[PDB]
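Figure caption, in words: inputs first, then the predicted bound structure.
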Amino acid sequence: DLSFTGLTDEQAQELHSVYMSGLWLFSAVAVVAHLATFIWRPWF
Amino acid sequence: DLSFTGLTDEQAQELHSVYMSGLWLFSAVAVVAHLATFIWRPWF
Amino acid sequence: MSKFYKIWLIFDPRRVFVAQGVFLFLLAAMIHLVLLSTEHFNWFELAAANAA
Amino acid sequence: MSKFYKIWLIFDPRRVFVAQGVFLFLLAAMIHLVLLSTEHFNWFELAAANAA
Amino acid sequence: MSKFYKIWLIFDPRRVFVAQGVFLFLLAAMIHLVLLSTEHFNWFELAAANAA
Amino acid sequence: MSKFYKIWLIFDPRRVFVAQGVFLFLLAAMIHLVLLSTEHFNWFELAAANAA
Amino acid sequence: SKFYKIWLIFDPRRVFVAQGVFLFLLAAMIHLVLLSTEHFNWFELAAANAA
Amino acid sequence: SKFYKIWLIFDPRRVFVAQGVFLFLLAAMIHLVLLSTEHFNWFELAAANA
Amino acid sequence: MEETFFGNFDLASLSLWLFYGFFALLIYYLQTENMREGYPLEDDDGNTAANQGPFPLPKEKTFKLQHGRGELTLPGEDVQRRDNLALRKTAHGNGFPMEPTGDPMLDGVGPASWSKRRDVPELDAHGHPKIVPMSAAEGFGVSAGTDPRGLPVMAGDGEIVGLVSDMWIDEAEQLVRYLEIELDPEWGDGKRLVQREMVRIKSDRVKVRSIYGKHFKNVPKTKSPNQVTLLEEDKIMAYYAGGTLYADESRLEPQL
Amino acid sequence: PEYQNIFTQVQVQGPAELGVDNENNLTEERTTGTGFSQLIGWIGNAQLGPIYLGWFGIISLVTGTLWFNIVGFNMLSQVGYSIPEFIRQLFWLALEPPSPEYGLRMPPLDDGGWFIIASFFLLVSVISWWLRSYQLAEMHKMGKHVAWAFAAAIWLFLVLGLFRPILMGSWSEAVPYGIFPHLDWTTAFSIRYGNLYYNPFHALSIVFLYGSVLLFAMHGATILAVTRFGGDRELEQIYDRGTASERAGLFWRWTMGFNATMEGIHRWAWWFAVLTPITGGIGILLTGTVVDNWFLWAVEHNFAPDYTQDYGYEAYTTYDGFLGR
Amino acid sequence: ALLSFERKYRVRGGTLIGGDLFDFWVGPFYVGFFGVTTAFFALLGTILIFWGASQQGTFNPWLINIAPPDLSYGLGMAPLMEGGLWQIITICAIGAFVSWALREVEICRKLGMGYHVPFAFSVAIFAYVTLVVFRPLLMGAWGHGFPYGIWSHLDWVSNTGYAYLHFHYNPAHMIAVTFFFTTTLALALHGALVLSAANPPKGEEVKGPDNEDTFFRDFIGYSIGTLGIHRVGLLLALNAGFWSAVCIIISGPVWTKGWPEWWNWWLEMPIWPS
Amino acid sequence: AGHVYANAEVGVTCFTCHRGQAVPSEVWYRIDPVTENTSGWASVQNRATSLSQFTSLPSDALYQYLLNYEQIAVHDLESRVETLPGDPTWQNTERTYSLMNYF
Amino acid sequence: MTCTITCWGIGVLLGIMTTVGLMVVGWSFLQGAFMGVLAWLIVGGVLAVAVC
Ligand code: BCL
Ligand code: BCL
Ligand code: BCL
Ligand code: BCL
Ligand code: BCL
Ligand SMILES: CC[C@H]1c2cc3[nH]c4c(c3C)C(=O)[C@H](C(=O)OC)c4c3nc(cc4[nH]c(cc(n2)[C@@H]1C)c(C(C)=O)c4C)[C@@H](C)[C@@H]3CCC(=O)OC/C=C(\C)CCC[C@H](C)CCC[C@H](C)CCCC(C)C
Ligand code: HEC
Ligand code: HEC
Ligand SMILES: COC(C)(C)C(=O)/C=C/C(C)=C/C=C/C(C)=C/C=C/C(C)=C/C=C/C=C(C)/C=C/C=C(\C)CC/C=C(\C)CCC=C(C)C
Ligand SMILES: COC(C)(C)C(=O)/C=C/C(C)=C/C=C/C(C)=C/C=C/C(C)=C/C=C\C=C(C)\C=C\C=C(/C)CC/C=C(\C)CCC=C(C)C
Ligand SMILES: [Fe+3]
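Bound structure (heme C present):
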């Protein structure tokens, strides 16, 4: 099993789930932020 | 069960609880500070 | 797809997170600075103009 | 989202807090200097202006 | 070809992904900057022009 | 909350005390200087102005 | 017919990265060559066709 | 003739990389010279015909 | 020459971009040539690091060593690595300093750390040992400056440990490399070497501020009194510089 | 304080070291007389070594003196053989290049004809010296890096006086042989062709010239910092690295994130030094021949800064105010 | 990560004002108390440059220009968009440079090596310090510092150079330049010596210090030695940095007139038979 | 009046240049053959004379420009131009530099 | 050293004396300094060679 960082198959799977959960939370805030800016001053 | 820093889940949960408690308190003061400035001079 | 988790078998999570933390803030800063360069989206000058 | 505490399983608290502490003060000085640069939000100029 | 997978027997996945990651962003940033240079596709003045 | 005392479990009290002592004085000196730079908040010049 | 013997001389790792940057620089150079030209400048044409 | 003995003199690896760089630089130089010329600039000529 | 091709891209622009491509290749060549030592990278646990940087290791180059010392290939298997280091990590992660388990100066871990060089003396062009005592030198003598032979040696804390017996000179390049210290029975026994670059010579005495009086008895010795091997040479020099941080806690602890 | 290895505190002198020699048999053309100087020994080797009297060196020395003398006697003839005036105006006199109205044709002796003769002898001496460096490295079975590094200096040397004047259509483009006059030429060259600040190859050469001084302060201090670990013996550290190479590397790895080897440092050191005249030679070669105004070249290529403030002193002060009245 | 030999040298201690609080490494870099201040000052100065670039209207690296205030403002603080930002970046630059030099002290103290490098950097800092804070004070206006632009600070050198009528005749500039050329000359020859000795023609043994020592003995008749070249080279570069500081600190506040006219002392002496 | 009355109404009088002496100071003559055994451009510049401002720049700049209406501009008005014979060279720039140094 | 350093010190003192000695009888500081510097090189070198 290929693993350059020493993480196991299950270890990376669990780490990605939390990282992706954080990515969606960060994106969700940005999406709400963009809508508020678009309403305040649209760029299209 | 990876732990690069050698911290158990119980140790990290206790440590993250205080960090978020500080993070909310730091952001709570910032929200009040931002609220006062918006009343003073709004930027929208 | 569902097998994107294998990026952590290639990349160290410690070094990526600091790399993206630096990258995201720099991107967040330069987008903000680009907006302030434009006269239309400079919210600091718009507030001054609105006060008149 | 509820598993965000795992950031401390990969980042040493006494190694990221220095980064976290520096970054916040870097911001706190950055926006304060940006506000002072703007003519509308320079609270030092406004006190002089309000004094006529 | 169905045998393109052998490129990873030649190239180290770690170096390629880092090189591809920086290349893709620099590609994306440059093309975005080229649009900002042109008058027709610069959406910042287009927003100003539309607002009249 | 009330468990902020754990900061000393990860940060040495001796080094933090010295570091903040330098930081606090440098903060105090800097803010006193920006007050002196501004004409309105320069308490030294105001005495001359009130002297007439 | 037997050009495959080039890899017996050239290192595939060094050649593949060599043309990887070379081929991109071909695209960058030719694209900017067109952009300098007033005729094959799709950015200027879109402004021109906008009228 | 029997020019195949040039490879007994020159290292094939050392001469192929030199030839490859030389061939492209020569091709780019000749192409760029035509662009400078007014008669053979196919970009300018295409605009003229349009 | 004086006319431009495709825009404002003239011959000066063509030369500029040609140099840009050459410089990028040069930086790749220059950076890779520095990867012949210390690579591949490792972590604090000793395992191979997951990240090796954007520059691959170069092709193996060979040095034809002189005086029949065989050949030498730099990239791969550094023979200078030390096996049993008396250190253990202060953190479970990476990026944190090591704390020596025992005596830092005796074990040679911090500034006192040496490198496992060859256990043979360095040779000049003639094949003779490069560094020899001036007593064994044929026609060498002090030409200028203060001669430290016979001057008492004063340690960092001010203790007098002995007098200089001889200086180990570099007859190939004609300069002093060491001073021999004949330790008093109180402060040790035998003779020890101190490099000239770590010693300061005054009018009446000669002093080293890096090592206290009690640490001279533990200075690494030489197997033979007529020559010093690169291993002993590295151990001796490292020990004195290790005292700049380990002579007392005041040096290791913050100065402010 | 700790002994900084700037001046040796004690120096020893033994029998003079002649050389290493091999079957190339360099001894016959090598001088048998050496001297020792303690004043220079405080900072370096105290032995004044013996010249190798090769034919490339002798020809370079003889023809170099011929160029030096020819320029000298024309300088002495400038002031009419008045030695006190010659000494007084020594920094001002020169052997001026030919007038521009002669082209590549041979000009009269009083109008640059002696400049061509002196330049020809200088060219022979400079090239012969380079051949001496190439031959000496060959006879020592060493690398030709000294010859190639010297050849980079020849490139700018040849461009300044030989290559550019030939393809500029006149010998007048050469540099005058004077102390201040070649400073005047240096300034007038930049003024005539716009501003060499805006020449990218001049800027590139400046990048490597600052980098060359930067590296050799870095390398000079770093080696002196590890000289307590025998870091001055760089060659032995290349073959068998000790703590000197490791500490020097880790000093710069911990400072700027990356380092070099004890051998790779000199490859970095060599190239910035070599690139300084190579880039400058290119910039001079295509200055005037290709680009006749560098600031205008900067304007059309969009790297010349624009200033929105007024250009008059009356816009910032007044004449009476400046004088205080 | 770590080099193949870096593990042993990574020991705690050797800090000036910081302790174990900042005694850690981030990647290859070593963070200290002054690495904390370096990170803060460098980031603040860099961001403010781009903030000024945003207000300047261009982000072109060639065209970015943060300039000092007018000479009418004197030594006092100026408005941020009228030169005040340049003063703050200068303050950040001084803090970043001094902390970087002080961090290098912590690096070499931890490694047991000499303090030559931070001292050598301090000379280059002094050259910058004399250009931005020393010369303006001697003139009574912060507007004499060079602007913070890639090409704008080239215009300042050009204008300041011609502000003294053919700067080439400046005696300290004359001394400073010949140190710059000699250092590059010394760098080329020294770099060539080691590379040539270590890299002989194929099939030849590597050359030791004796072979490279005698090469310049046969080349120029004197070799300064392996140790001598590094100390003379450091002094050659430090003198170049120091005399560069002199040539600009004596320009305005010492010799307001043209630089050729300085040489009037040599042209007009009683010994010369006028 | 476009020059003497440039900023204020400050004209020129008989005292303006004479300043109380019969021969006004800072008057100049033609010393163009500055150095011997020379001709052309080599004969006017390689010396520190009264007209050259303590430099090795040409001393004939005053004669050629302020008396003979010679062209003072030496720059090229385009980035790349066909450098043809008769165009100003660095010698002419050096002479213009000599004149303008006197300014 | 010692003797050589002292002999150099005598020269620089003599150089300073000649710098001000010629200033008294006329000359200028720069003209006097050159003679003073020249004196320091000559008598300083001669003393460092003959006396020592
Ligand atoms: C424009 C209108 C207002 C303005 C609007 C705002 C608004 C709105 C806000 C601020 C905020 C802040 N403003 Mg303001 N501000 C203005 C003018 C000023 C002036 C002044 C002299 O004029 C000052 C001094 C400040 C100062 C401040 C800071 C108190 C604060 C940002 C904290 C930060 O950057 O670093 C903090 C980062 C650190 C990490 C510093 C670390 C240093 C310390 C000493 C480290 C000690 C740690 C040690 C281990 C001990 C730990 C113990 C813990 C208790 C466990 N403002 C103008 C007048 N200002 C922002 C804020 O954060 O409020 C909370 C905020 O939201
Ligand atoms: C133009 C109209 C609005 C505007 C519209 C928007 C919009 C729209 C957006 C922003 C976004 C942002 N804006 Mg804005 N913005 C404006 C004006 C401002 C002003 C100001 C003073 O005027 C400020 C301060 C900001 C600031 C911000 C940030 C909140 C945010 C950028 C994050 C980023 O780039 O870094 C990223 C940061 C990092 C990755 C590093 C984080 C550093 C921490 C301390 C690292 C320590 C982590 C440690 C390990 C602990 C981790 C624990 C976790 C819980 C696991 N904006 C104007 C007024 N702004 C963008 C955004 O990101 O929103 C989310 C966004 O989408
Ligand atoms: C206005 C449009 C421009 C144009 C825009 C681009 C752009 C943009 C790009 C290229 C790229 C390339 N172009 Mg094109 N290209 C044009 C005209 C030409 C002509 C020509 C004689 O006119 C030729 C020979 C080429 C050749 C090429 C190769 C260098 C390359 C394609 C991949 C390759 O290497 O395959 C190897 C070649 C072979 C093995 C055979 C395949 C033949 C090629 C692909 C077909 C081109 C032949 C051409 C159609 C002949 C036209 C003549 C007809 C008889 C009328 N182009 C016109 C003038 N071209 C790409 C590149 O990589 O650049 C580095 C790129 O990004
Ligand atoms: C107003 C003046 C112009 C100016 C006009 C020029 C001109 C003109 C030139 C430079 C060039 C150079 N300039 Mg510029 N330059 C200016 C402002 C600057 C500034 C500054 C801070 O302002 C700097 C740092 C520089 C820096 C430099 C260097 C990067 C470069 C020369 C490198 C060199 O030594 O080559 C090394 C080579 C030589 C010096 C000659 C080699 C000598 C030969 C090989 C040795 C023969 C020895 C001889 C026979 C005597 C022997 C005697 C012995 C005792 C026995 N310039 C302004 C814009 N600059 C050069 C260049 O363009 O490079 C691209 C050049 O020609
Ligand atoms: C018309 C112009 C005049 C002229 C006018 C001037 C003027 C005016 C000046 C010089 C100065 C110099 N001139 Mg001059 N000069 C002329 C012609 C020349 C020629 C030539 C061949 O013609 C040469 C070689 C020189 C040579 C030089 C050097 C003596 C010096 C350059 C600065 C220096 O030493 O570093 C000194 C600067 C420093 C060492 C910078 C310190 C850097 C800091 C500490 C670190 C930077 C970190 C930074 C943040 C980057 C980090 C970012 C990345 C993370 C890495 N001049 C022309 C004729 N010259 C300059 C000088 O002396 O400055 C002192 C000066 O002001
Ligand atoms: C001073 C003597 C000579 C010298 C020596 C020298 N320089 C040195 C050293 C030494 C010995 C180091 O140890 C140190 C180092 O680590 O180098 C890798 C360094 C160094 N000198 C450097 C550059 C440099 N040296 C130069 C020259 C010289 N180097 C001199 C000739 C030059 C010139 C004149 O061109 C430059 C540009 C760096 C590579 C490094 C200093 C690194 C540093 O300070 O890092 C901390 C700061 C940052 C990462 C960024 C700070 C940003 C600021 C807060 C804002 C911007 C300020 C700046 C004034 C703006 C400039 C705008 C435009 C003018 C471009
Ligand atoms: C008869 C003497 C005379 C001559 C000859 C002369 N000037 Fe003037 N110049 C004046 C006067 C009178 C003024 C005052 C105008 C004023 O500033 O209102 C003046 C002012 C100036 C100004 C304007 C200064 C200012 O404060 O704006 C400049 C510049 C100038 N001169 C340059 C020159 C140059 C260059 C020459 C040589 C070609 C020259 N002058 C020759 C008489 C002369
Ligand atoms: C621009 C300054 C200028 C002005 C205006 C000017 N002159 Fe002159 N004058 C000169 C010059 C130049 C000379 C030539 C030097 C010489 O002849 O000694 C000269 C020569 C003379 C001479 C000859 C001096 C001698 O050597 O015998 C006289 C007489 C003279 N001026 C009278 C006057 C008078 C009267 C006025 C007032 C109306 C006046 N000038 C104003 C510039 C001027
Ligand atoms: C240029 O552009 C313009 C437009 C100008 C601009 O403004 C751009 C602005 C941009 C881009 C904004 C970028 C800002 C961002 C992203 C905001 C990050 C800010 C964050 C994330 C806030 C963290 C707060 C955390 C704290 C403060 C915790 C407190 C910690 C407490 C106090 C102590 C911790 C606990 C312990 C020590 C105990 C545990 C220990 C044991 C149990 C042992
Ligand atoms: C007691 O002493 C007595 C005896 C009196 C004496 O003599 C003293 C001598 C005295 C004081 C002279 C002192 C000389 C001085 C200060 C001059 C400095 C010199 C300087 C600064 C040189 C700058 C320019 C150098 C270049 C750049 C050359 C370019 C050369 C080119 C490359 C040559 C190319 C070749 C040709 C053009 C020939 C072509 C023809 C054929 C090939 C046929
Ligand atoms: Fe070296």
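Residues B 14-15, 18-19, 22-23, 26; C 25, 28-29, 32-33; D 13, 27, 30-31, 34; F 6-7, 9-10 surround A1EFU (ligand 9) (CB under 6 Å).
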